[PDB]
């Protein structure tokens, strides 16, 4: 399921100037836009080739949406402090996350409009796109405002209509990159730990998208409790990396098999040292 997400972060810096507003946009695991209020001339900048062919009008329009929301989130951070009865003195974080998941029918599958204040859920739009979930007493104040202003109407219309049409457009403009999965390049390394044990490390490199399953089995028995499994990490070039390591008795390496599952693989892999 393809998706488009926006990630906004507004951070107050008492005594260190205006709150910083940073925003990034993604199509799946591919970032396509940034905006940093601390930049020389803050603007919406393309981060993917499939959006740099949209006109100067598009970019001036995105730039304006960002510039205005950066000023708005500055108001929001003061409002929130007030709600929670917090001092002028402390640094606070306001985060927004919104977007759409595309369905098989070419229509919306799921719409998102979530927020967090100081890393905790603040207020979210429900899956029905007609109501809100206020996580506490403060968020209930916002919700009173939004129910009167009838804010869900605007959002339902964006997530069902506008969001889906842009994702479909962006997915077409970058179909050669966004709709082609890249299978992981896999291999096993061996690193002795003592004269009687060795680490077997299963590698998965240069894969896109990030979703992957790396497991080690000993005689077909899942070694989930004995596997060191690092978090999926960016290679820095738009592809991802992951590894699963297991400490095996020396001479017993052939009893171990690594299993790889990825969208880009026609069948799951089984690797042996």
């Amino acid at each position: 399921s393809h998706s488009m997400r926006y990630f906004d972060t507004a951070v107050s810096r008492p005594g260190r100037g205006e709150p910083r507003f940073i925003s990034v946009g993604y199509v799946d695991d591919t970032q396509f836009v940034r905006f940093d209020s601390d930049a020389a001339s803050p603007r919406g900048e393309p981060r993917a080739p499939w959006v740099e062919q949209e006109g100067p009008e598009y970019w001036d329009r995105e730039t304006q949406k960002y510039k205005r929301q950066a000023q708005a989130d500055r108001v929001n951070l003061r409002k929130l402090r007030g709600y929670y009865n917090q001092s002028e003195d402390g640094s606070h974080t306001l985060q927004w996350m919104y977007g759409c998941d595309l369905g098989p029918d070419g229509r919306l599958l799921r719409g998102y409009d979530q927020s967090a204040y100081d890393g905790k859920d603040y207020i979210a739009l429900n899956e029905d796109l007609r109501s809100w979930t206020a996580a506490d007493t403060a968020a209930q104040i916002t919700q009173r405002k939004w129910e009167a202003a009838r804010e869900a109407e605007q959002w339902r219309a964006y997530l069902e209509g506008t969001c889906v049409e842009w994702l479909r457009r962006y997915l077409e403009n970058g179909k050669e990159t966004l709709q082609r999965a890249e299978h992981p390049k896999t291999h096993v390394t061996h690193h002795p730990v003592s004269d009687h044990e060795a680490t077997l490390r299963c590698w998965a490199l240069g894969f896109y998208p990030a979703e992957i399953t790396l497991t080690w089995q000993r005689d077909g028995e899942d070694q989930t409790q004995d596997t060191e499994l690092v978090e999926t990490r960016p290679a820095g070039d738009g592809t991802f990396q992951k590894w699963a390591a297991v400490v095996v008795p020396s001479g017993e390496e052939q009893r171990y098999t690594c299993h790889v599952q990825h969208e880009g693989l026609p069948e799951p892999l089984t690797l042996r040292w």
Partner: peptide, 9 residues
């Protein structure tokens, strides 16, 4: 492309 309006808490 971003939501066309501003959100105030």
């Amino acid at each position: 492309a971003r939501f066309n309006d501003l959100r105030f808490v």
